[PDB]
Amino acid sequence: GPLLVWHRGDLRLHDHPALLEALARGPVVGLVVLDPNNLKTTPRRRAWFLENVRALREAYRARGGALWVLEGLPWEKVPEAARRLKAKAVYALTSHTPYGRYRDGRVREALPVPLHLLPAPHLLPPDLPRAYRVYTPFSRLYRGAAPPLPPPEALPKGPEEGEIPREDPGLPLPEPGEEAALAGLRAFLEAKLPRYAEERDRLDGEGGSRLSPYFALGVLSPRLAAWEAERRGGEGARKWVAELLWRDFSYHLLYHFPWMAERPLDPRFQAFPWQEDEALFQAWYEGKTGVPLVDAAMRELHATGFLSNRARMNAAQFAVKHLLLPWKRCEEAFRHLLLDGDRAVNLQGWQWAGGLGVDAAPYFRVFNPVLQGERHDPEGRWLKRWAPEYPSYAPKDPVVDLEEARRRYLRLARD
Ligand SMILES: Cc1cc2nc3c(=O)[nH]c(=O)nc-3n(C[C@H](O)[C@H](O)[C@H](O)COP(=O)(O)OP(=O)(O)OC[C@H]3O[C@@H](n4cnc5c(N)ncnc54)[C@H](O)[C@@H]3O)c2cc1C
Numbered sequence: 001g002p003l004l005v006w007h008r009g010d011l012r013l014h015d016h017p018a019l020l021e022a023l024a025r026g027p028v029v030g031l032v033v034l035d036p037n038n039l040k041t042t043p044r045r046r047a048w049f050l051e052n053v054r055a056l057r058e059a060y061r062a063r064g065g066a067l068w069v070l071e072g073l074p075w076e077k078v079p080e081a082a083r084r085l086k087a088k089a090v091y092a093l094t095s096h097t098p099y100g101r102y103r104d105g106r107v108r109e110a111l112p113v114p115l116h117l118l119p120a121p122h123l124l125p126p127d128l129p130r131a132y133r134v135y136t137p138f139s140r141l142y143r144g145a146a147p148p149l150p151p152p153e154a155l156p157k158g159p160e161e162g163e164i165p166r167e168d169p170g171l172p173l174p175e176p177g178e179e180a181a182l183a184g185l186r187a188f189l190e191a192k193l194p195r196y197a198e199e200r201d202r203l204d205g206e207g208g209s210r211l212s213p214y215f216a217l218g219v220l221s222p223r224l225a226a227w228e229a230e231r232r233g234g235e236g237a238r239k240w241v242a243e244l245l246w247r248d249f250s251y252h253l254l255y256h257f258p259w260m261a262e263r264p265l266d267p268r269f270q271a272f273p274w275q276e277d278e279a280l281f282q283a284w285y286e287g288k289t290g291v292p293l294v295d296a297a298m299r300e301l302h303a304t305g306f307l308s309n310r311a312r313m314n315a316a317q318f319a320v321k322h323l324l325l326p327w328k329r330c331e332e333a334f335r336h337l338l339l340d341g342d343r344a345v346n347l348q349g350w351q352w353a354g355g356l357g358v359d360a361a362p363y364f365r366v367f368n369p370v371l372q373g374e375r376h377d378p379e380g381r382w383l384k385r386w387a388p389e390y391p392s393y394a395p396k397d398p399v400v401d402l403e404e405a406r407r408r409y410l411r412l413a414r415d
Contacts, residue, residue, distance in 0.1 A: 012178045020149055121148070124252065
């Protein structure tokens with residue numbers, strides 16, 4: 001009987017504990033279940049997922065192995081695959097998300113054979129005992145990346161089943177799959193890593209790796225990335241790895257403070273006068289606020305599904321501090337437009353850029369839409385690409401009075 005390796009947010013063969021744990025015991029067959037709880041989202045994200053699932057199968061085939069793809073509820077499809085294959089056991093990577101736990105508990109209940117869950121690779125586990133709300137103390141626990149596990153050279157033969165739907169992303173998608181991700185990592189490390197600390201703030205984000213869409217679906221292991229970067233060493237690597245840690249910190253936060261999905265980490269904001277004005281929401285959502293920077297960010301986001309970190313913190317804080325739009329609605333809409341949309345990470349980003357309690361970031365910090373755009377975009381090349389209509393980062397008929405908007409917020413916050 002074979003062993004089933006059930007892939008979830010880990011569409012890769014490199015550094016995969018569940019794959020190697022099963023392979024060491026006997027022949028394996030891979031499995032992906034197209035779950036409605038995950039796929040009932042926007043076309044761009046659904047396609048990104050499906051195309052990376054298609055790539056994993058090609059990766060299995062290239063090695064002579066078999067990847068089954070089934071559609072439906074995990075607690076019905078996993079047991080079905082196990083029965084049909086007469087699998088002895090199922091192996092997967094542990095998930096600590098609310099849905100992940102519910103799902104796996106349900107699957108364990110319906111499965112007649114063992115479900116073995118192994119720790120997913122992280123720089124720092126999210127289920128650490130101590131619960132930190134600040135980054136520095138959390139990051140100190142990190143003592144360098146452990147070595148990544150190797151991918152199999154070849155896979156045992158097995159029967160293949162299931163078809164992989166083709167969805168219209170509505171936009172240009174990056175190259176899907178692990179090979180593309182690995183090629184991207186090498187390019188970044190050799191070319192951009194050295195100056196990362198000095199270029200990581202550009203509004204166009206060309207100083208970054210642009211690997212978030214891959215990390216989001218586990219096409220690239222963070223442990224492998226950290227390991228490679230640290231092999232290069234230097235200020236660049238230290239800084240880039242620090243950002244990988246911010247991702248783990250995001251999972252750590254949501255795991256220890258589940259309620260932050262519902263309310264701000266900082267209690268003294270639980271009752272902020274969020275003015276829900278449908279008219280303003282659309283202006284922001286469509287990037288029609290009249291503010292060069294924000295409009296540029298939202299426009300690129302709608303067209304590409306990607307946005308540099310600097311742009312995200314600008315477009316995000318603008319909505320929360322200036323327009324006072326409720327964060328909950330804005331964060332969901334933001335996530336749905338991102339190819340790398342990750343609930344935990346997006347939530348930390350919003351509660352951080354929105355001065356809602358993450359890393360005890362100060363509320364009094366308020367970005368200056370025009371300065372920001374000039375200090376992080378030289379010949380205004382970025383602005384000229386997403387909002388040519390604007391001659392500069394100067395407000396041309398703003399949906400609100402920046403100056404008053406600032407005073408307004410600071411006033412509200414101060415109390
Ligand atoms: C309001 C807001 C929302 C965000 N939502 C998401 C989201 O849904 N999904 C997502 O992947 N990232 C999110 N980020 C974090 C971040 O902006 C990206 O990970 C980054 O822009 C990816 O570009 P890159 O791959 O070139 O990053 P690089 O600079 O090359 O960094 C490498 C990796 O480190 C991680 N990383 C970098 N910055 C951060 C950060 N601030 N927090 C957590 N991890 C980080 C990412 O995995 C990234 O791929 C958000 C940030 C903000 C301010």
